[PDB]
Amino acid sequence: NLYFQSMSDVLIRKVRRAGRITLSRPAALNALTCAMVQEIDAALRGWIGDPEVELVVIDAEGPRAFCAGGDIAELHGRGVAGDHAFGQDFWRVEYRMNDRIAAFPKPIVSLMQGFTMGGGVGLGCHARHRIVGETSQISMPECAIGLVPDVGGTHLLARAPGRIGVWLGLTGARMGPGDAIFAGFADRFVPEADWPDLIAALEGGDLALPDHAAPEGRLPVLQDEIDRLFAGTLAEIPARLEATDTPLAAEALKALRRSSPLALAATLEILQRLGPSAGIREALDLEYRFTYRAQGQADFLEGIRAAIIDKDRSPRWRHGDPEAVRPEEVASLLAPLGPQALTF
């Protein structure tokens, strides 16, 4: 019943021909908990064999946010205390779900209003048909908290044209609906006033999606400068930014200066290993390597303390600048996990 789920953080049900997932926690911007991720993945798994399910539609309540990230305050407590296992387990099931969505045998449509960041990208941006609207703003601002973009984030980042993945990934920069499409985080623009009808039509198993131009964004014209500025390694990029008196370069440099140098360096290294041709599992695997080690070996806990727990915005990172991160140290964070390796 939807009545029996009137206190649940995600609404899971079939409506006509469609399995339906609606995030129902708008007061916390639909932030993802362990329990929600478990429930979504169970539902999807069970819909594989159900012949009444011809497709899945994923949506969310509230006008502010499809889904603004993982509910990660959970993870700092059970974390600075030495219990790294909570985060490790959570990421394991999350990344499995991200993979389940990506390779799902039946069509999945995502409709993502407002803010989609972090875990939210994992939930919506691997669907086969990803719809954005007028209020849609998508970013991966993980490095600002001492993590790499995860949940398959790196797969999408690596596939974006030229060096746009680098820029998005190291700076946490926003994409509106036009730029999300251009960059490959979504497929179609559809006005948000049309969405109740669209979803009804989809519930009836009609997979036709209406054709509209997205509003133009900044990426097509920024592409050339993105491609010049974000070439090479982190030993080269900050100096190139400093020489460039433009809003683009200046906003990027501030992001670089504020974020965890270790997370920046690892993000770049993941993107470089991946390239555009890799599948989602390569990416999840590399992300897990970092995130499995992040609580004890990287800046994640201090990142969360600064931004989420104490809110002083004054993180004290393991390194003083991106230029100072040793390659050997990135290599260790991204080394195979052996028996702890992610599996499907």
From TrEMBL:
Coiled coil: none
GO molecular function: 3-hydroxyisobutyryl-CoA hydrolase activity; lyase activity
The keyword Lyase is assigned to this record: yes
Span of domain Enoyl-CoA hydratase/isomerase: 19-333
Lineage: superkingdom: Bacteria
GO biological process terms, semicolon-separated: L-valine catabolic process
Catalytic activity reported: 3-hydroxy-2-methylpropanoyl-CoA + H2O = 3-hydroxy-2-methylpropanoate + CoA + H(+)
InterPro entries in UniProt: ClpP/crotonase-like_dom_sf (IPR029045), ECH_dom (IPR045004), HIBYL-CoA-H (IPR032259)
Assigned keywords, A-Z: Hydrolase, Lyase
The protein's Enzyme Commission number: 3.1.2.4
Cellular compartments per GO CC: cytosol
Name of this chain's protein: 3-hydroxyisobutyryl-CoA hydrolase
